[PDB]
């Protein structure tokens with residue numbers, strides 16, 4: 001079967017690096033051209049790269065066996081022994097972390113189901129604070145299956161150890177650089193996105209994260225190369241690659257207007273020919289359609 | 304094109320009624336046989352039913368223009384004027400609520416980005432409490448585009464009105480009954496799942512919700528008829544229906560062992576012949592052929 | 604605060620108990636009620652007035668609104684041991700009602 | 713509490729300031745440091761001891777651990793106004809360090 005794409009508008013899609021809707025579609029030459037994102041990375045033949053998961057509910061989340069201890073001056077401290085989010089054992093291998101683990105930096109608020117021994121309460125949802133990166137003094141090693149989080153508390157929360165699923169509540173001091181995967185040491189990583197022909201720039205699917213910011217009210221953008229629906233589409237179909245890249249058209253299904261042509265490289269990113277200096281945003285109610293295979297040197301018409 | 308199914312194990316799928324992974328696959332004759340869920344409802348031909356959305360990030364969420372006022376004795380009160388989660392205007396029509404709105408009852412903790420005027424803080428994430436149903440004294444009308452939530456506070460949180468996306472943090476007093484969609488009046492609803500032939504029971508994809516429980520530590524289960532990946536798969540493919548139902552086989556991808564045979568009815572639910580029985584979640588669903596609605600299955 | 608009551612009230616089996624919920628003058632011509640159970644805003648309304656001073660009794664519970672002193676009085680009669688739990692003084696309004704939590708304890712005679 | 717310091721401290725340009733971080737006896741043989749910036753646990757370490765009482769001087773920050781009274785003193789010299797912000801008294805350990813937030817204010821000299 002010839003490679004095709006799901007008939008879904010980006011505005012109805014799921015983001016691949018933060019569990020939120022896709023809100024924007026744009027190119028921006030002023031941003032880093034070859035980001036080393038580890039989630040939202042898939043090959044057109046279906047191979048998942050980095051820590052990319054299948055389901056959008058795995059994105060920027062983790063699962064663990066949790067052990068709780070109270071330390072005066074810090075609060076309730078959680079030691080998370082990581083597990084793959086479906087329950088199967090996590091073994092350090094050719095990826096940076098368990099599938100879906102956050103691939104950005106900053107201080108992340110996470111939510112977990114906690115059980116207490118305090119009389120009159122049993123099940124509650126506790127917000128924890130967890131530093132991600134870029135460098136920490138907390139010795140985070142998700143590659144080895146262990147991370148530390150804490151909640152500021154004057155007395156012990158009296159929590160019972162057990163299994164948890166952690167979901168992200170907010171990001172503080174966001175930086176789009178890979179987190180501390182292995183206490184400062186190196187890990188296997190999906191390569192930087194690229195290369196691009198001269199004049200080609202990355203197409204960005206953008207969402208905005210819940211954030212903590214003491215001084216700035218502007219929304220915090222985060223980009224991914226492909227929406228999560230495209231990731232599971234390629235992973236489920238397992239197409240055969242018949243050339244070097246795919247020529248795509250982004251067109252309004254109602255009006256028929258062709259908005260642009262772009263190139264979907266085999267390695268899982270989309271390029272547009274754009275010479276402008278500033279960011280150019282696109283409507284999100286179009287549809288991507290595969291036109292044909294093209295060589296990597298195929299020259300696109302500029303946006 | 305003949306109908307096919309995504310090659311994904313259930314344990315790797317997204318739940319369709321609460322934003323969490325699928326953890327369980329089971330049938331249970333002791334549960335209500337014909338649930339009237341409004342999310343996770345799709346026709347095999349691609350038609351979305353009820354409030355079912357395309358993306359798993361819309362499930363049990365909403366979007367709104369928020370207006371905040373402090374009321375002594377209650378706290379900071381939020382009036383949410385609902386909008387579809389992509390920003391398009393919500394118009395009361397043939398559905399119970401904006402797409403993806405929760406279709407269960409209880410007290411829901413929600414999280415929204417809030418902006419404060421207090422010096423030293425600007426952007427924060429505030430947890431609100433929002434009663435869903437089954438009946439409330441809060442006059443919730445998501446069908447009409449307005450719901451109310453509150454934060455218990457001794458003084459105002461000093462929040463700025465604006466647009467928000469609300470995601471579910473926990474459920475309190477969960478009940479699998481449709482919420483108060485219209486201040487007690489009735490709304491257009493997807494019909495109850497069914498019917499089933501004698502001996503056929505609903506196949507349930509199960510996850511467990513983050514919960515607030517003062518006395519019980521057991522997990523809070525919630526079922527859906529189809530995983531979210533199946534919903535968007537049918538919605539994007541828009542297959543042609545050639546009969547009444549499709550016969551499916553659920554087999555171990557490694558061993559090849561057939562675990563059970565089932566029927567996927569055109570209306571978007573799976574039935575098995577059973578007289579609670581849980582199944583492994585690492586199998587694959589494979590379409591065998593179209594079958595008549597009266598096709599009798601082999602019992603599990 | 605719009606409505607205040609006793610934090611805890613106790614009665615005896617087959618007996619009665621009385622709860623006084625005081626409110627501010629603005630809430631005179633609103634309906635008052637006595638609610639039971641949690642979650643708070645899905646509780647079962649046991650009895651409710653019609654915004655008058657007329658006594659209304661349903662579900663073993665009676666209520667009388669004093670609109671001169673701005674206090675409505677709730678009485679629970681023929682108490683059972685199962686009557687213990689969480690209750691609320693309520694004022695019916697559009698949206699979120701003014702409510703006050705009252706804990707009820709029951710014992711033998 | 714493992715480590716305590718001044719919640720707010722002020723100095724003047726081209727001048728100096730001193731910060732005292734007191735700790736409990738159990739942390740004597742641990743490394744002590746002076747951190748800068750937020751998020752807390754991604755701060756830039758300006759100066760750090762080697763768990764001894766020997767004085768350590770970096771570009772403009774000094775640290776000396778008094779292990780009899782259990783106080784390590786941080787000194788910032790030749791202050792500039794860009795030095796204002798959030799700082800931390802730190803004790804190096806595996807995992808979450810004991811830390812104390814210090815807000816530093818800088819102003820000009822009255823003229």
Ligand SMILES: C[C@H](CCC(=O)NCC(=O)O)[C@H]1CC[C@H]2[C@@H]3[C@H](O)C[C@@H]4C[C@H](O)CC[C@]4(C)[C@H]3CC[C@]12C
Nearest residue numbers: 063064085086087113163164165322323511512513
């Ligand atoms: C107490 C929680 C349920 C509440 C919850 O946090 N739900 C997640 C959500 O609402 O998004 C339980 C229910 C099922 C549990 C998971 C499943 O049992 C599968 C798996 C089993 C592993 O031993 C531990 C991780 C992992 C993944 C478990 C983590 C804790 C979960 C998620």
Ligand SMILES: C[C@H](CCC(=O)NCC(=O)O)[C@H]1CC[C@H]2[C@@H]3[C@H](O)C[C@@H]4C[C@H](O)CC[C@]4(C)[C@H]3CC[C@]12C
Nearest residue numbers: 020208209210219366367388389390416466467468
């Ligand atoms: C302040 C937030 C961003 C932070 C946030 O809440 N992100 C969601 C998450 O992290 O899951 C902003 C950024 C983009 C906004 C959305 C988009 O502008 C689209 C849409 C526009 C409508 O006027 C209001 C709803 C809706 C859907 C907006 C709700 C508020 C959002 C989501």
Ligand SMILES: [Mg+2]
Nearest residue numbers: 137138139183
């Ligand atoms: Mg380290």
Ligand SMILES: [Mg+2]
Nearest residue numbers: 213216218220
């Ligand atoms: Mg910001």
Ligand SMILES: [Mg+2]
Nearest residue numbers: 439442486487
């Ligand atoms: Mg009503």
Ligand SMILES: [Mg+2]
Nearest residue numbers: 516519521523
């Ligand atoms: Mg429960």
Ligand code: NA
Nearest residue numbers: 440441696698
């Ligand atoms: Na009301």
Ligand code: NA
Nearest residue numbers: 137805806807
């Ligand atoms: Na450390």
